[PDB]
Amino acid sequence: VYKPVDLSKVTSKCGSLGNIHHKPGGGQVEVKSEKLDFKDRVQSKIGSLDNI
């Protein structure tokens, strides 16, 4: 007789948000720019937020 039990209920309430900027100034072997200016705003909330 064997009869183990594993992971009997598994509930996922999950997510992934990316704002990706992969090489906007570009390039690898000859690269030039005059201003880079970053003023991004992030207001993320993650986990449990239920109001009830």
Distance CA 35, CA 27 (A): 16
Decide: 25 and 36 in contact? Cβ < 8 Å. Answer: yes
Minimum gap (Å) between residue 3 Cβ and a copy of itself? 5
User: How many residues of this chain interact with a copy of itself, rule: CB under 8 A?
Assistant: 52
Find the shortest distance in angstroms from Cβ 7 to a copy of itself.
Answer: 5
Residue ranges in 9-48 that form contacts with a copy of itself under rule CB under 8 A: 9-48
Q: Which two tokens stand for residue 5?
A: 């039990």
Measured from the CB of residue 27, what is the shortest distance to a copy of itself in angstroms?
A: 3
